[PDB]
Symmetry: C3
Subunit: 494 residues, 3 copies
């Protein structure tokens, strides 16, 4: 093994990664599995989670783990936790739940009756310290049914199904070791199962939720993303300029704000179903659609009217037309790139071919840009990786750059037209190299066999694609009509 050789060269014994030894460049450590619990969803036969899933899907995983015993009153919760977890108490004392002086007389009710007392630690977590509860939106619904019903009103691609569908059914999550993608589970699960993603516990302050910081921890990246798209627009620059002195205590409403934030435009008038204002779900802009077409007029008009809070509607209309035009141009480059990549596959010059790689997460040796394949950036060919990057990392983000008025990210920036250009050159470069090698090998009669490292290795060998077998899919999950579903190749049903 690599570890055995490295052990003799660097003079450090081989051992398990988890024993506490400081391994020199990690060279002689052997991978050990962390403790797992079973994952939920249609791939439950092999999907794993780390036990810390208890906090994010508590209905299915939460158990008692406290060493403190007793049945306590609310005031006892506060007195002790003032010493034991002081900031939780400080947050709670600065919240409407724990302070009547900041209440606005909203008219909150539980079981038809007004909630006039403080809402304490015990009211949300329980009175028995050995049977403490870790809540979800189901608790909040007792007293905030409107916000909860909206939070639960989204379709696929919204907070509503972020975890239940888009973690448990998603290829990139199910195809990887659980501990590699813990952050995916939690980011998506906080969005779905909690009410603290925007207004954090334990202050639960709406003023905090109106700030772009309420969204950007999740809405960033693929490198750049809507955070960078917003922050590099003039709206984002004005947010930075005015944040410290503007009145964040004002409701999200026409005329209450000079500078628009994520919440202002997407949680219009406090609507807790922010997805619904979108024209149409486009798989993060990977699917091409002209939002200015006659069939989408009601949606376009609604956006124009939102912009009219602070602008001429003609100006707004022009800007959204620039989006449509910019998006349509961006897809010519993706189609150019796709032709080159698929062309290489049809000619059999891709190295490795699907047969030379580890099997995909379905357990098949299928080209990733075919229907039934798994588009990905890992455990695949360079050509396939670059293709996925073109469509996901770049083409989708061009739409986001136009949607958020980032002149820079539309053009020179990350996720831009010019990044698409450069990626197209990279793809053509790979393709050209592949074709020059194949042409030479053909002519001189060399029989090329793709290297073993495309197929086997310490990480590649951990992939679940190796252990897929017939009948390992819970197709009853996919038969459910109460949630939407991803169109996975092994779904087994409609």
């Amino acid at each position: 093994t690599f570890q055995d050789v490295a052990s003799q060269v660097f003079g450090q014994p081989v051992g398990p990664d988890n024993d506490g030894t400081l391994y020199i460049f990690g060279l002689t450590a052997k991978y050990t599995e962390p403790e797992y619990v079973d994952g939920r969803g249609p791939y439950k036969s092999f999907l794993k989670m780390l036990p810390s899933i208890r906090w994010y899907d508590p209905e299915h995983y939460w158990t008692n783990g406290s060493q403190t015993e007793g049945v306590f009153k609310n005031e006892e919760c506060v007195l002790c936790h003032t010493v034991q977890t002081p900031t939780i108490v400080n947050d709670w004392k600065q919240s409407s739940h724990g302070s009547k002086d900041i209440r606005r007389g909203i008219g909150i009710k539980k079981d038809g009756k007004p909630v006039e007392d403080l809402v304490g630690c015990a009211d949300c977590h329980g009175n028995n310290h050995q049977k403490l509860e870790m809540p979800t939106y189901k608790l909040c619904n007792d007293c905030h049914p409107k916000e909860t019903a909206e939070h639960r009103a989204g379709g696929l691609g919204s907070h509503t199904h972020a975890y239940t569908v888009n973690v448990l059914e998603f290829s990139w999550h199910v195809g990887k070791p659980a501990e590699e993608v813990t952050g995916c589970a939690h980011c998506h699960a906080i969005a779905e199962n909690r009410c603290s993603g925007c207004h954090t516990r334990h202050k639960f302050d709406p003023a905090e939720a109106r700030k772009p910081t309420a969204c950007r921890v999740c809405h960033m990246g693929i490198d750049h993303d809507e955070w960078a798209m917003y922050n590099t627009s003039i709206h984002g620059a004005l947010y930075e300029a005015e944040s410290a002195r503007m009145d964040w205590g004002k409701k999200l409403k026409k005329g209450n704000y000079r500078v628009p934030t994520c919440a202002y435009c997407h949680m219009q008038n406090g609507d807790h179903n922010p997805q619904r204002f979108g024209t149409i779900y486009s798989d993060m802009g990977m699917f091409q659609v002209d939002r200015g077409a006659p069939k989408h007029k009601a949606k376009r008009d609604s956006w124009i009217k939102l912009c009219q809070d602070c602008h001429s509607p003609r100006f707004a209309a022009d800007k959204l037309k620039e989006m449509d035009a910019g998006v349509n141009l961006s897809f010519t480059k993706w189609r150019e790139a796709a032709a080159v990549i698929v062309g290489c596959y049809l000619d059999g010059v891709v190295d490795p071919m699907p047969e030379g790689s580890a099997p995909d997460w379905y357990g098949h040796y299928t080209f990733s840009l075919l229907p039934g394949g798994d588009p990905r950036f890992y455990a695949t060919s360079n050509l396939e990786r670059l293709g996925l990057e073109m469509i996901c990392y770049l083409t989708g983000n061009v739409y986001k750059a136009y949607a958020h008025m980032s002149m820079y990210n539309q053009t020179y920036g990350n996720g831009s037209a010019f990044e698409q250009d450069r990626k197209l050159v990279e793809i053509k470069t790979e393709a050209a190299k592949l074709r020059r090698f194949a042409a030479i090998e053909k002519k001189i009669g060399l029989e090329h066999k793709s290297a073993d490292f495309w197929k086997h290795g310490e990480y590649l060998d951990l992939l679940p694609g190796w252990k897929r077998k017939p009948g390992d899919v819970d197709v009853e999950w996919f038969k459910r009509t109460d949630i939407p579903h991803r169109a996975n190749a092994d779904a087994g049903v409609e």
Copy 2:
């Protein structure tokens, strides 16, 4: 076509991109041209703009597009727009134009007479709602001649000619479909034609203009740029630390600020010609010049004295000498890279050679690093792309990192020495691959022909290089002496 094949594989009909259909990965959609208007400048015979250029070059493109009819008084503008575009009115009411209580008695005059009344919507836009005006600096000049004259005093590479010259004459803009580069036109045109780039409409607040946020929406990137260079210096960190509590109402003046901002150093004492403090124009640091040489002493001394607002002049002098030294070292790596790239061209081993690519925007098949060629990151070879990245994205930004005291971006960061190192390896890697292929093909007698995808494709076919013909340049534009010009290969004149 690609669309036809994809249509049969994915089961979605081919169609135009603009009909509103949600196209699966955009695979079966066909590119349609957006509505265009003719562009201005020396390439007016084929340059196009989207119609939204009306807002940014209104003198040449603005037309009535309102549905509201009438001739109104100022107070009528305000009453109705309070409902129709509330934030504009709120901004205006919080501006000196719309509120006497915040005026400073500057002594503003129009046609020799003092402006003592409110300056309302009608005073800037007109009284007739069917003949509304969209202004430029020409309006502001009526009452603010000093600021306007300075705004118009810059040379090439300043706000003064950002659009008129550096959009309308620039290869990367004229060589691309209009809708791909809308953001370029607007970013550059806002800088040139407007007075709202730093102090935004409709508050027009100088305190806002003093903040780095007044500059960073435009002065960012190539990936990193002067924003990142400033933000990652100790000055930038202190700006973030002190922004919320410092007094931004103070004039840009020696002793009024602890933390220097872009405006402080470049709009010294409120000068609206920020380019003039620069030692010399260097094409964004792509041209090498030692700013510490005896011939530039007056400029260096002026910078040292600016720094002396808050520092020892000896310290400042040392720091600017570090810039000079760091810059000069950076150019050894670019010259190393250029030798390798040009060497490959001279040996004819570049794939594709210029003849194998689409023609450049001049309509020629010329190597991009020759005089008369078009240095670019798109529609070119990987080797040429990497070269352009070395000089533009990296070498120029090394200067910016030193100029703005970013220890990190000088060394490990984006646009740094170490990024130059890595790019040099990438260039040598490409060169080495090209030479190994050519050596093999020579010896075995394979006649390599560069792939068709370097030349043709859905995006490449839209490029204006294909439709260039003799006599399509307005050389009278280039003959103008009232504006500077870019030294374009097809200029036809001096």
Copy 3:
């Protein structure tokens, strides 16, 4: 030369880079050495510094350079500098040193006696303007012995030895021209030799030092780093949300803060030896260690208790276990990558082989991933560069992403699992190309010789590896036991 040819093509004379000429793309300029002074440390025989090192290692390099003569009283320092360097005086007047009204009666003493007077310019810099002093922590120790002793209590990898060891002994610094790495010397030297890195001169405000801005100018990057890791966690988002209105005047203490900052967690209770709270030094996470192993329990428990200021200890424990699991998974990908890269070397297919490159900074032609080699991103093969990037830029930062609770940077972001994936594909791609070339060349009988540009060039020729000779190491430095040392190949001792 390149310059001579370029001179004839572009029509600009060859000349020295430093004469002030504006060189077109820098093509015809010739590199000149800047003025140097000798560097300190074990490579003093050839290590150079720019003379500006005077400010950062003043004990060894500071000299008089003032034109102002006289012996002055404190009040005279202030009166004149109010005109000459106004912000220094403004800072000083707003500091406890210069204003009794903001003193807290800490009980500061010098030579056993209470310091009750103002501490003026002369008290820190001297009274004679021709013998002015540029201080280090040695000055501050006179009145602040506790903070200084802690600042000096760190081991290797802390502020305490940042410059003395990790600049003067480090391969990447000693192997490069001085002016390329000025920023390295200063960043590391400010951390070691000064007391102004966090609370800047001349205000020396602890409230400023508590902010993340006190750390991020140095603690950023390798592209992303702990700044990005912190800023993209929910803690970082809350810092941005609350910074403008929170009370930064509160001591770093349990219950004084809702949002934790770098200082809060690493300078626990004002401890000026922030390294000591770390479990173990791991060379920036390049060495693999399971911080959750039984042997590290005291450290893990201490972190859990720190988190318990604001959280359940069970939650904190789970989060740190996610770190351990995530880190261990990350090292499988590095070991996979290392096997591929070393495998290529063992098979002799790396282009260039070490013999085809310039010598490393030791003066040897050694493969960079061997013991005694120099792991690097510059002046090496693409395969070796990509390897260094995998372990340093990526694998180390995965640990940082988990340590700072950045769900995004653990997974999709910079320095993440998915970036590791992509880098692994890049490495395998390079390896596969190298093996396909070698297999062809073998079969057709082509004797490949690696290109000259891997070995010689304008930058490569400046490297100190060329001028290394026996007996050029000051091994007495490495024999010192009062400082730690790097395990350099040419150390000559234990």
